[PDB]
């Protein structure tokens, strides 16, 4: 539908991937935080996996 | 809406360029027919001239 | 969105019809030059026959 939509969409997607990677690192190193709530939020399938 | 905007904008720009180039393309048959018309009207005037000259000279002999 | 879409579709349709019309003039110029060639050949034959006939009458009178 939009062939070039991937080219320009660089900052938002890279920023979101950075956010998810930081989430992974925090959850890995989190030795105390074990209660979380993400209901009613916009969480992508790729982020879910 | 944004997706449809992108796709329709691309299609419109591409088809507009297509039309521009194609109309730039077609200029040959018109020019050839124009040259034919010009030379053949030259013939038309030449034959009118011959008609008038024949009339004049034949009338003078008359 | 609907206002922008109506304006966009109307403008694209107008441009499509306008370029189709320009192509129409481009083809009809060839058609009209062919028609001019046809009319000029008809006039060429008319004036050739006129030359022949007036020459015949003039020679008969001489």
UniProtKB/TrEMBL annotation, chain A:
Superkingdom as given in the UniProt entry: Eukaryota
Official protein name in the record: Kinase domain protein
Native species: Tetrahymena thermophila (strain SB210)
Residues of the full protein shown: 248 to 296 of 345
